[PDB]
Amino acid sequence: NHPMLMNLLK
Amino acid sequence: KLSEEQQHIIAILLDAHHKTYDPTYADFRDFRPPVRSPLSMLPHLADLVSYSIQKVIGFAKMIPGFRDLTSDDQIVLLKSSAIEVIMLRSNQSFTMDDMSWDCGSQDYKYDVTDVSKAGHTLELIEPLIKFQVGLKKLNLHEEEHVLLMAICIVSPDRPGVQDAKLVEAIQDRLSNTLQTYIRCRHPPPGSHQLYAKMIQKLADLRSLNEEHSKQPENSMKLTPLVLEVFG
Ligand SMILES: C=C1[C@H](O)CC(=C/C=C2\CCC[C@]3(C)[C@@H]([C@H](C)[C@@H](CCCC)CCC(=O)c4ccc[nH]4)CC[C@@H]23)C[C@H]1O
Asked: DSSP letter at B108?
């Protein structure tokens, strides 16, 4: 559901 | 007395803010241009918002104890906070002379009628301007500004939070820093009820956020990141 959000975190 | 850990928390948040907010606004060149027809300002503000979402994320990561949360809790917190922390940040560029957001140049001076041209009614714009005016009137130290953004983000009562106790524990530490800050570092008469007034600005943002949650051919003109965050 939130790959771009989780990318910018990691 | 402000503790060493508290001044460290402030020092961090000031720096974190410096890295995530560029007051030259030089990146604005890269957005779809502003056209001043219906929704002529939508593409350009959607990009600004998208860019701003990213910056807020960069800032969040630097909040002490935020990294200690699960990636899920981080994700939900930023989903709910994004738009609030953007309205907050924006106070920096906002001026009460015009009641507009002045980002270095005419093309990037955004007034009520620009926000309107991104497809927004006075129902949102008005609580929004009253907010910027109220916040400007507080005249926060840059230290109080960044603490308030951190505190806004890490709120245990946002939808989807699993480990509220940990979110709450991280937040408490920031508010205590802010409360102790104000006492020790904010002189009167500015210091008067300034914490309760700040917490009020947090309640005004939750409303704005909820009103915005209420307010396809337009969904296209948004960005991937914006669609991901607002659904
Ligand atoms: C770098 C920055 C900050 O990140 C943000 C900034 C200005 C921010 C502004 C001034 C222009 C208008 C902004 C972006 C607002 C949006 C139009 C916002 C309206 C208020 C919601 C309660 C809607 C967000 C939204 O869903 C949208 C916008 C365009 C298409 N969809 C929200 C905050 C408003 C300039 C500068 O201070």
From this structure: G
Distance from B88 to chain A by nearest Cα, in Å? Answer: 20
Contact B97, B157 (CB under 8 A): no
Question: With helix as H, strand as E and coil as C, how does B11-22 read?
Answer: HHHHHHHHHHCC
Structure determination method: X-ray
Position in ligand 1 atom list of the atom nearest CA B91: 37
Resolution of this structure in Å: 2.8
C-beta atoms of A5 and B229 within 8 A: yes
Sequence-ordered list of residues with C-beta below 8 angstroms from that of B77, at least 6 positions apart, any chain = B60, B69, B153, B154, B155, B158, B161, B167
What chain B holds in terms of domains, given with CATH numbers, is 1-231 (1.10.565.10)
To the nearest whole Å, the CA of A5 is away from the closest chain B CA by 7
**Residue in the block written with tokens 């219906």:** B38
Contacts of A3 in chain B (CB under 8 A): 228
